[PDB]
Amino acid sequence: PIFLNVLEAIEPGVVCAGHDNNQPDSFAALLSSLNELGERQLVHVVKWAKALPGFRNLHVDDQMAVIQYSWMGLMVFAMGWRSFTNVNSRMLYFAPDLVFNEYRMHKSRMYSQCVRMRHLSQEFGWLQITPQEFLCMKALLLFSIIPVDGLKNQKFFDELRMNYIKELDRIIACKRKNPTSCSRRFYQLTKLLDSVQPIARELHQFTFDLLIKSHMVSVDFPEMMAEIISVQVPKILSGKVKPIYFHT
Ligand SMILES: Cc1c(N2C(=O)[C@@H]3[C@H](O)CCN3C2=O)ccc(C#N)c1Cl
């Protein structure tokens, strides 16, 4: 398949967080690094998204927005998958140097949101998600959140999102599936995508509050990341931009 050649051909590489595992595990130590990973992962997502099939049909002022609104979720999705394939959903494999043990889950103060992220990671296993299904879902994921008043050129956006929903269905369907089998895996796969949204929302809020009190707690925020968290994220939380759920 052509569409799959590119998806796999573009899948990023091992991005390291550049954490100092030697020094102890302070809350600040963790997040100042998580944030740094955010930053690093952000860049790759841009190069990934931009080199996506038909991605350039979007309006210039829509390409950037689509990516920034969707980066947490995307970072979450892939991260869940790394965890799965690597530590087998036992811990959260943020990066090779930033792997989360139960201790870290609690020291980051994100224990719970992490329970959630690890939960999603387990679905790849439980549901037996396929690398081909993962890649397709990840891509669609990007086209899963937009402003209520629509983008600059909504028509291109939706057209693009339609072609993606179909690539997903084209992959899930091509084996022992038929009727109840096809109209069951699609429900779950789309049910799995919807779940990343709630998690991203809670991560958004955490990060956002974290940026405001930033100094009070001595947590590091990169130029790039901080902007998004102050300009695009507020827009999500206030309601200006909302996710796109297949269900409910
Ligand atoms: C989710 C997340 C974050 N992440 C974020 O970007 C926000 C802020 O960094 C604060 C908490 N939170 C995170 O852990 C950073 C990097 C990666 C990767 N790889 C992921 Cl999956």
Nearest to 49 by CA among 77, 70, 76: 70
Please tell me the distance from the alpha carbon of residue 157 to that of residue 180, in angstroms, as a whole number.
31
Q: What angle (nearest 5°) sits at the alpha carbon of residue 166, between those of residues 163 and 168?
A: 115
Residue set of the binding site for 17beta-hydroxy-5alpha-androstan-3-one: 35, 82, 207
Is 214 in contact with 119 (CB distance < 8 Å)? Answer: no
Please tell me the distance from the alpha carbon of residue 22 to that of residue 149, in angstroms, as a whole number.
49
- Per the listing, tokens 């920034």 go with 68
What's the per-residue H, E or C state across 7-54? HHHHCCCCCCCCCCCCCCCCHHHHHHHHHHHHHHHHHHHHHHHHCCCC
Give the architecture-level CATH label for domain 1-248: Orthogonal Bundle (1.10)
Residues 6+ apart with CB under 8 A from 40: 15, 16, 17, 18
CA of 33 to the centre of ligand 1 (A): 9
Q: Would you list the domain boundaries of the chain?
A: 1-248
Question: What residues are in contact with ligand 1 under a 6 Å CB criterion?
Answer: 31, 34-35, 37-38, 41, 75-76, 79, 94-95, 203, 206-207, 210
Instruction: List the determination method.
Output: X-ray
Residue located nearest, by CA, to atom 19 of ligand 1: 94
Say which amino acid occupies 110. M
Please tell me the distance from the alpha carbon of residue 9 to that of residue 34, in angstroms, as a whole number.
27
